[PDB]
Nucleic acid binder design. Structure first.
Lengths: 57, 534, 51, 50
DNA sequence: CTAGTTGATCTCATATCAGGAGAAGGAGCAGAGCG
DNA sequence: CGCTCTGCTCCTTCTCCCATCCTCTCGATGGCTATGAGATCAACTAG
């Protein structure tokens, strides 16, 4: 580009369409299951859906 | 001597000299003086308004009505080009008024403040220019003036100008405006004039706008919903009757039978763009500059000026038989060639108008390229030598075409010897082009005068003409009759950065738009419910 | 208070184009809207427009 | 900042540490006067630190 | 002294996700006098 | 017997901070509205 050799660096990201159950120590939720969902042929950003459990008390 | 109701002895040997409308005007001026209000003598040019004013002030001085034994010190603010005329009018009608001009030419030969002090000390008649009001706005307004007459009071058309503020800093209840047209562009101007003559009648400018100007113009478009036009008509009626007892305007329809007026015909030529001019205009309307204008990132006004220059001539915008301003490169100058040739073969005499002085010089060079004798007067000519030029054109026939811009010279410089007139390019103001056509066709015009307005179809200039007509319609609705057939579209009228040149298969936009061509509490209630159903 | 030119120097680029400081651009916006508000209060403007 | 800029050390010493704008603005609102006793204040004014 | 010309100057027109930590306010509310 | 005046706790904003110094490359950045007429005025350029 404009005589300058430019190299694209591969960028890490969490995989999509997979359910990942984490547990944040400092939060109102005990457990949270997230899913960054994205249609096969991308047209919009990743729509993250969370399904959490409220912490006891 | 003629006598009025409370007693105002206008002298007989003056009052007899007036005409009927003039006597009506003197009556009205004195009705205001009793009410202690101001007003606008909105009679258009040529009726004679200075005569009415001198008549009324003379009657007020002789009648010794009283504060002040008779008429006190009065200031007249008029353009420089008419001050000497004013003093002569006084000296020929009512000599005993000690009239004095405030000017560098003047006659005082001493400190000008001493002139103000002396004239006020003698209850004289002092004439100034608007500039002296603006400059000495603090000094001149200390001597308890009894009358203020703003002749050609449309200089106060702008409520923001320093001249307006300086003129509204006068204190007397008696403010008279002598303007041929109280409003010229929109209702800003009417409000400013009324804020001068009578500070309170029309409200503050925000209120006046939001009540009148917006509903009215929204009802000036043919695509307006019926409710919008009906509201516009109602508000126009309210404004009309609100201003009725303070604006005395008479046309050349009722007074026509008293004075002769030769017939005037007018055409609007639609001049196709030349192919090179067409290409330049299309490149500009496709270039990124107008795109940035549409984005609002750059001021649209340069785009306007550029497109006007292009329609005038490509050499303006762009910058043998190829020298500067060659007349074959724009269609409007093709048409000017044809008209000038034909009229010279007819032996007539031409006024050649243009808003641009640069293209005025272009046209000068074109006339040198031809063998037409001519004369030029513009802003660059010294004022002291302006009268000779006009006289030399008017007295002989050995000069064919006289070059003007629409705005040079005093209002209505007497160009009578001309027969035909051409407005090479339209202006935004209807009043300036109207003045241009009126300048040739005045009182004491011997031959039929015709006006040819040169348009380039489908361009910016067609839109300028449309806007001129729209403003004229606005003024007419406000001043003569609210009911009017609606001609225009809002979006088409306001979007003015396009190019649709006619191919002669379809008619031009203008022709398409102009395709057709005590109260007994029951009369009070009846009028209220009538106005409210509208 | 609008600061002096030292606080917001107009540095000249390689050519003749004089680049203004961020403070100067902001003061330009402030003066623009201040003049705009001054005229809108002086001449016809709606209350919501002034607001 | 919650312990060091809450003592009576003077606004110029405090602005050197943290919350430069908040400290100087508080000092302006309250008309505080820095007696130029610390080393930071003299260093800023190019004076010989005590 | 007297006009007149010629510059400069100014006014007025016409344009529409993997932070953290502490400090302050606010709100819910338990409870104690006490009118 | 119902109101006031606390003052405790939970949450919620909200705002502040995140080592020092040094080298290099690379890209982006650029702001333009006109025109003319009138009037003033002060200086010559003649009288």
């Amino acid at each position: 580009i404009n005589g300058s050799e430019k190299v694209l660096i591969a960028q890490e990201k969490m995989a999509t369409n997979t359910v990942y159950v984490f547990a944040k120590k400092d939060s109102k939720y005990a457990y949270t299951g997230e899913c960054r969902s994205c249609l096969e042929n991308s047209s919009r950003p990743t729509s993250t859906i969370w399904v959490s459990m409220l912490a006891r008390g | 001597d003629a006598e009025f109701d409370e007693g105002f002895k206008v002298p007989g040997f003056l009052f007899k000299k007036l005409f009927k409308y003039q006597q009506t005007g003197v009556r009205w001026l004195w009705e205001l003086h009793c009410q202690q209000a101001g007003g606008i003598l909105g009679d258009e040019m040529g009726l004679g308004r200075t005569i009415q004013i001198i008549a009324f002030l003379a009657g007020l001085s002789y009648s010794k009505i009283r504060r002040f034994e008779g008429l006190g010190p009065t200031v007249i603010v008029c353009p420089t080009t008419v001050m000497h005329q004013w003093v002569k009018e006084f000296h020929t009608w009512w000599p005993p008024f000690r009239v004095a001009i405030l000017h560098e030419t003047g006659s005082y030969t001493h400190k000008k403040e001493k002139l103000i002090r002396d004239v006020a000390h003698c209850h004289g008649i002092l004439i100034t220019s608007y500039s002296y009001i603006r400059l000495m706005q603090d000094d001149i307004s200390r001597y308890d003036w009894h009358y203020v007459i703003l002749d050609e009071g449309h200089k106060i058309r702008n409520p923001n100008a320093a001249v307006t503020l300086a003129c509204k800093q006068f204190r007397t209840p008696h403010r008279i405006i002598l303007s041929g047209s109280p409003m010229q562009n929109n209702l800003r101007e009417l409000w400013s004039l009324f804020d001068f003559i009578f500070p309170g009648k029309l409200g503050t400018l925000p209120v006046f706008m939001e009540q009148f100007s917006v509903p009215i113009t929204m009802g000036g478009y043919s695509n307006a919903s019926p409710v919008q036009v009906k509201t516009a008509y109602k508000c126009a009626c309210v404004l009309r009757d609100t201003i009725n007892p303070y604006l005395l305007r008479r046309m050349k329809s009722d007074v026509k039978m008293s004075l002769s007026l030769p017939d005037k015909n007018e055409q609007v030529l639609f001049c196709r763009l030349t192919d090179e001019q067409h290409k330049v205009y299309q490149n500009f309307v496709d270039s990124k500059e107008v795109y940035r204008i549409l984005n609002g990132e750059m001021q649209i006004f340069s785009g306007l000026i550029a497109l006007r220059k292009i329609c005038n001539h490509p050499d303006l915008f762009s910058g043998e038989e190829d020298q500067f301003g060659y007349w074959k490169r724009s269609g409007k100058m093709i048409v000017v060639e044809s008209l000038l040739k034909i009229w010279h073969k007819q032996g007539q005499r031409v006024l050649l108008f243009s808003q641009s002085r640069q293209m005025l010089d272009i046209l000068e060079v074109f006339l040198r390229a031809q063998k037409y004798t001519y004369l030029k007067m513009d802003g660059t000519t010294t004022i002291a030598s302006r009268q000779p030029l006009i006289t030399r054109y008017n007295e002989d026939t050995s000069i064919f075409v006289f070059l003007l811009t629409t705005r040079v010279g005093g209002l209505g410089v007497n160009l009578t010897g001309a027969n035909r007139v051409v407005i090479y390019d339209p202006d935004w103001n209807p009043s300036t082009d109207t003045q241009a056509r009126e300048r040739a066709w005045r009182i004491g015009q011997k031959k039929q005068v015709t006006v040819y307005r040169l348009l380039t179809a489908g361009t910016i200039e067609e839109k300028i003409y449309h806007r001129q007509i729209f403003k004229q319609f606005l003024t007419n609705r406000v001043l003569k009759d609210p009911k009017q057939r609606r001609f225009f579209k809002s979006n088409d009228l306001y979007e003015l950065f396009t190019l649709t040149s006619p191919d002669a298969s379809q008619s031009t936009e203008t022709s398409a738009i102009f395709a057709g061509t005590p109260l007994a509490s029951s009369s009070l209630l009846a009028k209220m419910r009538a106005r409210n159903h509208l | 208070p609008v600061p002096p030119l030292s606080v917001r120097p107009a540095v000249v680029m390689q050519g003749s184009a004089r680049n203004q400081d961020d403070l100067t651009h902001k003061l330009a916006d402030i003066v623009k809207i201040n003049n705009q508000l001054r005229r809108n209060e002086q001449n016809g403007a709606a209350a919501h427009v002034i607001a | 900042r919650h312990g060091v800029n809450r003592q009576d050390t003077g606004p110029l010493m405090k602005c050197s540490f943290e919350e430069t704008v908040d400290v100087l603005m508080e000092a302006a609102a309250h008309g505080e006067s820095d007696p130029m006793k610390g080393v930071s204040e003299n260093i800023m004014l190019g004076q010989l630190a005590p």
